[PDB]
Write a protein that binds this ligand. Structure first.
Ligand SMILES: [Cl-]
Ligand SMILES: [Cl-]
Ligand SMILES: [Cl-]
Ligand SMILES: [Mg+2]
Ligand SMILES: [Mg+2]
Ligand SMILES: [Rb+]
Ligand SMILES: [Rb+]
Ligand SMILES: [Rb+]
Length: 135
RNA sequence: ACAU
DNA sequence: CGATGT
């Protein structure tokens, strides 16, 4: 119903899907960029959306912040809830980096606690998420 | 169908 | 138009 402005918003950007994947997190209220992942040569949209949420969890935990995280990705929200990224991307030499990051993200979720609410950004009502790449 |  | 996902 109402945007929770006191929050972190995350999003993926890609060149191809699968293709080059990056992600960032912004302060929902101001658009200030709070973190940005160096581009990963091959990944999927959903792997990037997942990594962005997990990085947000880690970022807020390190800072003792109870703010929620917004993502527009139904898939990634579910993967984080399950602590399992059910990607179809082939595991081979050229996808090794993205899969290492995804594996490490799951490992972190399995060994740490958090209360951060992970909320669906309602694009149809609110427009593009504030972390969007505009591409 | 919905979300990207 | 293609691809990633529930
Ligand atoms: Cl990552
Ligand atoms: Cl909340
Ligand atoms: Cl959701
Ligand atoms: Mg998105
Ligand atoms: Mg976007
Ligand atoms: Rb902490
Ligand atoms: Rb975009
Ligand atoms: Rb589809």
């Amino acid at each position: 119903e109402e945007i929770i402005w006191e929050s972190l918003s995350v999003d993926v950007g890609s060149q191809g899907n699968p293709g080059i994947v990056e992600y960032k997190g912004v302060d929902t209220k101001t658009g200030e960029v709070l973190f940005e992942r160096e581009p990963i040569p091959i990944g999927t949209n959903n792997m990037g959306e997942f990594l962005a949420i997990v990085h947000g969890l880690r970022y807020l935990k390190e800072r003792n912040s109870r703010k929620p995280i917004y993502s527009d990705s139904q898939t990634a929200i579910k993967w984080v809830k399950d602590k399992k990224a059910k990607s179809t991307l082939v595991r081979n030499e050229e996808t090794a980096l993205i899969w290492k990051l995804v594996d490490e993200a799951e490992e972190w979720l399995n060994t740490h606690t958090y209360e951060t609410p992970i909320l669906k950004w309602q694009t149809d009502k609110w427009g593009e998420i504030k972390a969007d790449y505009g591409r």
